[PDB]
Structures are given as structure tokens and as C-alpha cells.
Design a protein around this ligand. Structure first.
Ligand code: HEM
Ligand code: HEM
Ligand code: HEM
Ligand code: HEM
Lengths: 146, 141, 141, 146
């Protein structure tokens, strides 16, 4: 799902300034807090009682980083999203049994976070690009479902 | 479905917005019109250009309605009863569009109050917004 | 968000169900376990086999809770306050699973009361079920 | 999205007894009544004020029949859903601008209706088959979206 020539140039231009370890760790924590039912898939991470326990949890900072790294592998191969997420699809579908509506959520939170971090440089136009460059990842991940 | 501490979070979070509510609803709108084009459908009579004085105008309409609901959380069905009729009886807006404007509204706040937009305030505002989205789309007539 | 005539539709529709509520919640459950396998996740300790006396057992649990809410529509938050804690605080069930069981429940009723399942009764029961789905998934603590 | 060898045989075995004109006319009417915001796409059909005006409306009985015929063309070509709905996809997406969550709805209502009509022969097992043979059509229709 290609955005455009000019758009795309600006999309990869932002990802360079993206600080993985922090952006991804706040995105997962934000998801566990706002939509508390997803906490159920991460019991082995330990204590997630309140927002303080969750943000400061090490496993969450760790795992959050890997999820963020996975997005980057998508922000680049925009042309092959359905083969770049082929295996992950199989893990989240038949193995973990996660509902696809959650891929959605994490996607938008990842965006609400990119907003808080880059401020006025995250222009409504840029946000528009990311909104698709996110929705595509959400769809690839649900493909190898049936 | 708003808890006790969700209410407090909301009332307090909206006091920090203060008098920019109008400004914010305008920018939250502009973000939606560019990211989710399917919405320009409910606005054929408007000028959707970037500096549109029509959007700034409507934005205000929207920001004010919100500040209104913040002062009557203990009975949102009673205070928005007219907006509920306009959006559900007359305009027949698809409810999925409500999740979008709410999302763009939350994106605006992050850009302007990066230090007050704490995760806990995020969870409350999201719920508060959902209550409002549910009311406006319910035909209880 | 239940109107005046939605209430009447509900109270009356559930009187036709009568004493098969138990039976129906059991079959509505079985339909969900086969059509939406992702749900066998919240039931690892159960025997999900076709003639399971555990499902029949739980089905009853479910049917009864509903008949309970039908008698207290004017305050569902007050009557289900405990089931809300179990499903939202302890079990942490995904809210999307609620739309599925509701759908399977409505499919059962169509099979057993084809003549009473009028379009108007369909619209009310769907909304009544949604109210119950909203309460059970709200952490107002 | 193939179901199975034994399943499939039973799926086509039910569609033979399906009475198009009525099954499809009650499915559209049911949708306009239960989820009243979809009424917005059919204003030229006339009066849809209440459930009585809608069920007895001619355009709805007519159109409902065509939608039902379209499903059948799917119940058969289960192997080529994304090429069998290729054009419809283009109509409902960029032309009409319908949200994909509605494809979902009409799908389940089509099922709630098949239940009311065939009673105890619409076994939970059969319903399970139809639940996918419906979800696939819903997905094909959203494919040529982006
Ligand atoms: C839609 C965006 C998502 C992406 C890109 C994504 C990506 C990933 C990645 C990269 C891994 C690690 C695989 C490995 O280490 O071999 C993973 C694991 C996992 N994901 Fe996701 N995920 C997403 C959403 C979700 C959601 C919403 C849930 C929550 C229900 C979920 C639950 C899990 C769990 C529990 C694991 C196992 C972690 C472990 O034990 O190593 N994922 N995901
Ligand atoms: C929090 C959500 C929303 C609030 C607070 C809200 C509030 C308002 C208010 C106050 C008005 C009427 C003001 C007047 O009487 O002049 C209005 C009008 C309108 N709203 Fe919204 N609205 C919301 C969401 C939406 C959504 C999601 C859509 C659809 C994308 C929408 C579409 C419209 C339209 C088309 C009008 C009429 C414009 C005109 O003809 O002047 N609204 N809204
Ligand atoms: C209208 C919807 C629902 C109602 C009326 C309802 C009602 C109930 C009741 C009465 C109980 C507790 C009875 C007891 O104390 O023994 C219960 C337990 C349970 N429910 Fe729900 N429930 C609903 C939907 C769901 C959904 C959507 C799920 C998830 C798919 C779910 C998962 C469970 C689980 C796992 C238990 C505990 C079983 C056990 O350990 O014994 N319920 N439900
Ligand atoms: C997901 C299942 C659906 C299927 C299989 C389907 C199929 C069709 C078919 C076969 C046509 C006729 C094309 C022709 O005559 O050339 C059509 C037209 C149309 N559909 Fe759908 N449709 C579906 C859902 C929807 C939904 C949910 C909406 C409502 C928002 C919608 C709105 C329309 C409209 C307004 C037309 C134009 C009718 C006319 O003027 O001829 N469709 N659809």
C-alpha cells in the first residue's frame, strides 16, 4: 500500500529520528493501561497492577523495543508487507489466538505516542501518511489467519 | 461507565485545556479530514481548504459542546439530548466515524500538552470520549 | 440508552423465552465454541465436547443472569455490579468476544421462536444485549 | 478459505433449499431496521420510517434478491473469492464509500435469518461452516480498498 513519492520520502525521514527503546516501551505500556484486557496476554511479565508498575516494568520495555523494530521492518518494505509479516501472522493467529482488532489499537497508540514526542513537527499531513503505513501492517498481520 | 477517578481526571484535564478548546477542535477536525477522507462526505457544503474559516467556525462549535459535557458527566444523556437527535436522527452519521474524530482529538492534545498527557489521563479521556460517542449515536426515541 | 418501547419489547420477548433460558444459553454457548474457536481460550478447565454437562451447567448460569437483568433494566449497573468485576477485573475478557456471544445468542432465538423474532424485537434485544455487554466490561473501580 | 471436504458438501447442500427472493429480502430489511444508520445509503428507495414500511418496500425485496444471488456466486467459487468480488469491491469502496464493518453485519444477519428459516436442521456445526463461508465474502469485498 504505497503512499506516494513525496510522502514516502518524509515517512522514512522521520523514522531516522525515532528512538526505538523509548518509543516502543511507552507504546506497549500505553496499551496495557488504556485497554486493560490485553494485560491477559502478558501475565508472565509480572506485576501490571497500575500504570506505575507497568511503565517501570523491564519486560515491557524490552518487548516494546522488539515490536517497534518490527514496525521499522515494515516502514521500509512497504511493498512486501504480506511476506514480511508472514511468520508473525502465524504466531499471533493460530498460536496465540489474538483478536485482529488489537493490531488496530496498538497501531493508533503508536501514533498518539509519535505525536507527543515530535510535537508541532508531526504535522496533520505527516500523521495522515503514518495512518496508512500503520493500517497496512495491521492487515498483513491478519492475512495468514484463516 | 465512568468511574469516580475518571471523572476527576476529566474535569481536571479539561481545565488545563482552558480556552483553547475551540482552537483544538478545529485542528482535531483538520487532522481527520486529511487522514480519513471518507469523512469529507458529511461535509459537502463546507470549504475544506487548509485555512478554512468554516472549519475554524465549526471547530468552536465542537470544542464548546465538549466543555458542556464535562460539566454534566453525571447525566450526559440529559445535556446532549439535542446533539444526539441531530447526529443520530437527522444526519445518520456512521458510529465508526466517532472513533476517528476521538482519535484525532487525542492526537491534538498530545501535541499541545505533552507534559499533562500522562498515561492515566489518556485512559480517562478515551473513556469519557467513548461515553459521548455512545450518547450521540443512540436513538432512544 | 434503552428507550421506553425497547424496555417493553425486552420484558415481553423474555417472557416468551420463559423457562428455556437455561437451555438457550447452553446452545448459544456451543454455537460460539464452534464458530469462534478463539474463545475456547477462556475455558481451558472445561470439557468442550458436544454433550458436556459442564457447558449445560454454565449455560444455565448465563441464562439466569440475563433473566436477572431483564427485571432490572432501570439500573443494570446496580444489579450486575459483581459480574462486571468478575469479567472486567478478574477474567479480563476481551470486549470483542461479547459481540460474538450476543450474536450466537440471537441466532439461537431465531431457531426456536421463528414467529416471535420480529424485526422490531430483533432491534430491541440487540440493544439490550449491548447495554449488558457495556456494563460487564467497564472497570468503574 | 476452504472449510473441508465433508463440511463443504453440507454447505452446498443447504443452498439448494435456499429460497432467494425471501431470504434476501428479509436480510436487507433486517439490516435497515437493526442498524438504522445504513438507511442512509438507500434514500432513493423511498419510505423506510418504520419496520412495516421497510419490510413491505418493493425496492428492498428487489435489491435484497440480488445481494443474495451474489452470495451464492461466492458459496460456489470458494476458491476464487478475491476475483469473483473484484468489481463489487471497487463499487462499494471508492465509489460508494461504505465502511467495511457493514459487510460484517449483513453477513451475520444473513445467518440469523438462515437460522429462523431452517430451525433445528441449522445445526451448530453447519452454522460454523457458514460463519467462515460468510467471513470470506466479507474480506474479498474489502480487498480492492486501498
Ligand atoms: C499489531 C502489531 C503487533 C506487532 C507488529 C507485533 C509483533 C510482535 C513481535 C515482533 C513479537 C516477537 C516474536 C519473537 O520474538 O520471535 C511478538 C510477540 C508476541 N506478541 Fe505481538 N505484535 C503486535 C501486536 C500484539 C498484540 C495486540 C498482542 C496482544 C494481545 C500481542 C501479543 C504478543 C505476545 C504475547 C507475544 C509473545 C512474546 C514472547 O513471549 O516472546 N502482539 N509480537
Ligand atoms: C465528539 C463528537 C462530536 C461532537 C461534540 C459534535 C458536535 C457537533 C455540534 C455542536 C454540532 C451542531 C452545532 C450547531 O447547531 O450549529 C455538530 C454538527 C455536525 N456534526 Fe458533529 N459532533 C461530533 C462528531 C461528529 C462526527 C463524528 C461527525 C461525522 C464525521 C459529525 C458531523 C456533523 C455534521 C455534518 C454537522 C452539521 C454541520 C452543518 O450542516 O452545519 N459530528 N456537531
Ligand atoms: C451476556 C454475556 C455474559 C453473561 C450474562 C455472563 C455471565 C456469567 C456468569 C453468571 C458467570 C459466573 C457464574 C458463577 O459465579 O459461577 C460467568 C463466568 C464466566 N464467564 Fe461469563 N458471561 C457473559 C459473557 C462471557 C463472555 C463473552 C466470556 C468470554 C468468552 C465469558 C467468560 C466467562 C468465564 C471464563 C467465566 C468463569 C468460568 C469458571 O471458571 O467457572 N463470559 N459468566
Ligand atoms: C457485504 C455484502 C454485500 C454484498 C455481497 C453486496 C452486493 C451488492 C450487489 C450485488 C450490488 C448490485 C450491483 C449491480 O446491480 O450492478 C450492490 C449494490 C449496492 N450496495 Fe451492496 N453489497 C453488500 C453490502 C452492502 C452494504 C452493507 C451497503 C450499505 C452501506 C451496501 C450498499 C449498496 C448500494 C447503495 C448499492 C447500489 C444499489 C443500486 O442503486 O443499484 N452494500 N451491492
Amino acid at each position: 500500500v504505497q503512499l506516494s513519492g513525496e510522502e514516502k520520502a518524509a515517512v522514512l525521514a522521520l523514522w531516522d529520528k525515532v528512538n526505538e527503546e523509548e518509543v516502543g516501551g511507552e507504546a506497549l505500556g500505553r496499551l496495557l493501561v488504556v485497554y486493560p484486557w490485553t494485560q491477559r496476554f502478558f501475565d508472565s511479565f509480572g506485576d501490571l497492577s497500575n500504570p506505575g508498575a507497568v511503565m517501570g516494568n523491564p519486560k515491557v520495555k524490552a518487548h516494546g523495543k522488539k515490536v517497534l523494530h518490527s514496525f521499522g521492518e515494515g516502514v521500509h518494505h512497504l511493498d512486501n508487507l504480506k511476506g514480511t509479516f508472514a511468520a508473525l501472522s502465524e504466531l499471533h493467529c493460530d498460536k496465540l489466538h489474538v483478536d485482529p482488532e488489537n493490531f488496530r489499537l496498538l497501531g493508533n497508540v503508536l501514533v498518539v505516542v509519535l505525536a507527543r514526542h515530535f510535537g508541532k513537527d508531526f504535522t496533520p499531513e505527516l500523521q495522515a501518511s503514518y495512518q496508512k503505513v500503520v493500517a497496512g501492517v495491521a492487515n498483513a498481520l491478519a492475512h495468514k489467519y484463516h | 461507565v465512568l468511574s469516580a477517578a475518571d471523572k476527576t481526571n476529566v474535569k481536571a484535564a479539561w481545565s488545563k485545556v482552558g480556552g483553547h478548546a475551540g482552537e483544538y477542535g478545529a485542528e482535531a477536525l483538520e487532522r481527520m479530514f486529511l487522514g480519513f477522507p471518507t469523512t469529507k462526505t458529511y461535509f459537502p457544503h463546507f470549504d475544506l481548504s487548509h485555512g478554512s474559516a468554516q472549519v475554524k467556525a465549526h471547530g468552536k462549535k465542537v470544542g464548546d459542546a465538549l466543555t458542556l459535557a464535562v460539566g454534566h458527566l453525571d447525566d450526559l444523556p440529559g445535556a446532549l439530548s439535542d446533539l444526539s437527535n441531530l447526529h443520530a436522527h437527522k444526519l445518520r452519521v456512521d458510529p465508526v466515524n466517532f472513533k476517528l474524530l476521538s482519535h484525532c482529538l487525542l492526537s491534538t492534545l498530545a501535541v499541545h500538552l505533552p507534559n499533562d498527557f500522562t498515561p492515566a489521563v489518556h485512559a480517562s479521556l478515551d473513556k469519557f470520549l467513548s461515553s459521548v460517542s455512545t450518547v450521540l449515536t443512540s436513538k432512544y426515541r
